[PDB]
């Protein structure tokens, strides 16, 4: 059976990728940052699957994956690079440089040790590489519509102005470095590159250890009734669809060299609260109602059109109601 390497296999998205791979009986090697984490994955979370791990402690080290492909370079046909460096005042030193090292490094390892073996590389990017936050608020401007061809317009310099733009810029330049390496090495290496650009990722955890894997959801379910409502707005996507897209991206020829925008629709804090309160009557004594029916995302956000991605992937995404229901019902069951 074909071996698939998944970096950062303990992560929220990555565990769903490994789960869905093992559901299809792939042989999987995951990278983990410690032996303890790897043993937990192999002996507990993914017991029953053909799962092994390699220890890769620092994603920001550009040589971090050299040993993986020196030892396994004849076997790994598929690379799903979902890991990113840990997320300061020095945005350049602590975010931007680690990001470009953290994405291009594994591609260098493949070129050095497995150039004619790896067939497909899928890299987890972000909607942050499609648009800076500064450009996300041109409401109803169809000329501003963000698509898979859109790139974050901040520069290496201008994104260092604040930590939000800096983080978003780190995602932009990580993905750009992948493409620039790829286009400069397409003769030196066999693999074909594809990209996944998730928006805000919600959804249930693969394995439960009111603490969801989404900081947006966590903020909402920890709100007091009197509390100031935080400002959240953007696109949502269920982690299970994000993972499914990673797998289809290496299996189907039409997904080669695509940037696949994993985006199921728009939300604001108010639309999330409306759905949570509607789906969870049990929580109505705890969380605020806000002002139901207000905060229409179409009136807040630059339009987003990922019709191309949806047609290429060919399956309908989990909607926000089911996403939040599965996320929060898992959380409540875990409070037993």
TrEMBL record:
GO terms, molecular function: oxidoreductase activity, acting on the CH-OH group of donors, NAD or NADP as acceptor
Domain NAD-dependent epimerase/dehydratase: 4-254
Keywords, sorted A to Z: Oxidoreductase
CC annotations in GO: cytosol; fungal biofilm matrix
Pfam families according to UniProt: Epimerase (PF01370)
Protein origin, superkingdom: Eukaryota
InterPro entries noted in UniProt: Epimerase_deHydtase, NAD(P)-bd_dom_sf, NAD(P)_dehydrat-like
CDD domains, A to Z: AR_SDR_e
Similarity field: Belongs to the NAD(P)-dependent epimerase/dehydratase family. Dihydroflavonol-4-reductase subfamily.
Record protein name field: NAD-dependent epimerase/dehydratase domain-containing protein
Native organism: Candida glabrata (strain ATCC 2001 / BCRC 20586 / JCM 3761 / NBRC 0622 / NRRL Y-65 / CBS 138)
